[PDB]
């Protein structure tokens, strides 16, 4: 029908009052109604450069305002003095018949002709250009076009993967002024621990974005069933995370403060962590050349915490879809080797329940997260990771995407069991503090992702578990499935 507006402020005050109360009340009631040790999150901030700190730093009132405005409106209502039916509306009169007769209509016409379609178009263009992995489309096109015409002759090194990475498209929108050669030179300056001079705020950004690009390259390489480029990708990612060039003796140059001109020239037989720890405590400082107790303690405490893995038991499992089961023992570089026989065999076995039978990965989904890494030259803070990829043994081709596990228990590294050292050589397993139920055993499960062959016989497989933030010891074992039916 034909309504009549309130021109004497008789109804719209209560209208606004209830409209505010119905959204305030829920807010008030909602407001009144309301594991894994990490020791690098404190030590990292002391060895990071100051410019990196500057970079990393650089790049409820609604309830009370609603209550007070409700109070004002309530007082305004209380201050007012206040057979055919006359229809009426609650909106005031000057909103429809005053001097603002074209204002409201032009504002609505604007909100219908400009803001909606333009914003929808921008959002569509922003969410249609990105691939599911989280990278641009031109970058994925470039990576596939580079893997297609790739001769088997050229041996994959770090430089070739850097040369592929400096062709990414996400590096153009960041700095439309630079060129691919500038990006390659910047990444070289980062890896060699060299200074950019003026483009530091660009080098840091491109290095920070390098992670997702390397993960995209790894996934597509595993897609094409090409192993060597995936291995190169993981190695280059280690290199960029740790800021060290890839050479034979790198496990010892990943340390915080070691001098190359002294270490390379004096000794040439120390190549890894165990061979290092075999020496005495003063000999380590003497060979590394830092001669500072207050600083030697820090380097020992960081070199005694980067996790090396080891296999205990691994075998197939045959549900409707097979999935591999791994039993690894995460240890540090100091604990001596403990045999497999003393393991009580209880933790290794799996309890058979309906909930566990339905989804066996539920138990793995419970273990804690991994701590923050030790990346004194990576801009942000990164968590450790573990990238596991499976390969066949008949021809040597990757046959599934890399499953990137994240959860693992690093408890066996804590400073509680320091009595278990290798330099004592006194058969330390028979100690009073040794508890065979105290050593925790992580567990990693990889879905096989492919149906079992219908033939009957032996079939070889091979699983790799490489680290992605340190230069520690990894896994490379060959297991075979004995299909018998």
């Amino acid at each position: 029908t034909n309504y009549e507006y309130d021109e004497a402020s008789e109804t719209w005050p209560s209208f606004i009052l209830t409209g505010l109360l119905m959204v305030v009340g829920p807010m008030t009631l909602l407001q009144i109604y309301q594991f894994n040790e990490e020791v690098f999150k404190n030590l990292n901030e002391e060895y990071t450069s100051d410019e990196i700190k500057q970079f990393r730093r650089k790049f409820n009132i609604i309830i009370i305002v609603g209550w007070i405005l409700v109070a004002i409106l309530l007082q305004r209502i209380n201050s007012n003095d206040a057979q055919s039916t006359s229809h009426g509306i609650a909106l005031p009169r000057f909103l429809v018949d005053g001097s603002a007769s074209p204002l409201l209509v032009v504002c609505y016409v604007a909100l219908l002709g400009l803001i909606l379609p333009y914003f929808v178009s921008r959002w569509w263009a922003r969410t249609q250009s990105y691939t599911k992995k989280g990278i641009h489309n031109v970058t994925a096109s470039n990576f596939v076009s580079n893997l297609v015409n790739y001769k088997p002759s050229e041996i994959v090194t770090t430089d070739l993967i850097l040369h592929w990475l400096s062709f990414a498209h996400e590096f153009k929108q960041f700095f439309p002024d630079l060129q691919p050669t500038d990006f390659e030179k910047l990444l070289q300056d980062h890896i060699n621990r060299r200074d950019s001079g003026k483009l530091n705020n660009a080098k840091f950004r491109i290095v920070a974005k390098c992670h997702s690009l390397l993960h995209g390259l790894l996934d597509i390489a595993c897609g094409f069933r090409n192993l060597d480029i995936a291995l190169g990708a993981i190695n280059t990612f280690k290199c960029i995370v740790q800021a060290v060039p890839l050479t034979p003796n790198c496990q010892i140059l990943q340390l915080p403060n070691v001098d190359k001109e002294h270490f390379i020239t004096k000794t040439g037989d120390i190549h890894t962590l165990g061979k290092l720890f075999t020496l005495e405590d003063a000999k380590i400082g003497e060979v590394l050349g830092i001669k500072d107790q207050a600083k030697l303690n820090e380097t020992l405490r960081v070199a005694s915490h980067i996790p090396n893995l080891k296999i205990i038991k691994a075998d197939f499992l045959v549900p409707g879809r097979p999935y591999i089961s791994l039993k690894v023992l995460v240890r540090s570089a100091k604990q001596p080797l403990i045999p497999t026989s003393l393991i009580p065999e209880e933790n290794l076995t799996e309890p058979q329940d309906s909930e566990s039978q339905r989804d066996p990965f539920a138990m793995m989904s419970k273990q804690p997260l991994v701590p923050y890494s030790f990346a004194p030259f990576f801009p942000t803070k990164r968590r450790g990771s573990w990238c596991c990829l499976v390969s066949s043994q008949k021809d040597g081709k990757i046959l599934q995407t890399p499953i990137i596990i994240e959860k693992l228990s690093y408890k066996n590294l804590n400073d509680d069991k320091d009595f278990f050292d290798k330099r004592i050589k006194m058969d330390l397993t028979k100690h009073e503090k040794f508890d065979i139920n105290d050593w925790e055993i992580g567990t990693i499960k990889i879905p096989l992702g492919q149906p079992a062959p219908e033939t009957v016989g032996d079939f070889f497989f091979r699983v790799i578990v490489k680290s992605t933030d340190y230069f520690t010891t990894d896994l490379d074992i060959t297991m075979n499935m004995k299909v018998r039916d």
Partner: protein, 138 residues
């Protein structure tokens, strides 16, 4: 990154410089070999690109670009065969097999030639110290 326009460049230079006649057949065989190699490469790469597409990690444009390249390569091969027929009368039933062999043979030749360059990469990457006679001197 192709040896197609090189044949046309050689033809244009022959139109004026009076080069010998066998060089034209040589360039034609080269073009044919490249065509057959790319045909095999596409035929053997189709399924994995299809899988990466259906997984939803490549986008939509490259799939169509690939499908177009599939037939562009065949069209190029047919035009090359026509040019070969124009070059010599009754020379099509043997050209296909000659091309099929030269492709594989030069592939092996390149893979073998690569080792002289490949040999020093490992030296640089592992910091070896090798004197003459290829022995180790620690």
């Amino acid at each position: 990154n192709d040896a197609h326009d090189l044949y046309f460049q050689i033809k244009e230079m022959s139109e004026n410089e009076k080069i010998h006649e066998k060089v034209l057949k040589a360039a034609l065989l080269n073009r044919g070999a490249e065509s057959v190699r790319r045909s095999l490469k596409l035929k053997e790469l189709a399924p994995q690109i299809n899988l990466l597409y259906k997984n939803g990690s490549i986008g939509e444009d490259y799939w169509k670009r690939f499908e177009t390249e599939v037939k562009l390569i065949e069209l190029e091969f047919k035009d090359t065969l026509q040019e070969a027929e124009r070059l010599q009368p009754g020379w099509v039933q043997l050209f296909v097999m000659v091309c099929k062999e030269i492709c594989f043979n030069q592939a092996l030749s390149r893979r073998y030639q690569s080792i002289l360059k490949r040999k020093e990469v490992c030296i640089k990457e592992w910091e070896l110290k090798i004197n003459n006679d290829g022995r180790l001197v620690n």
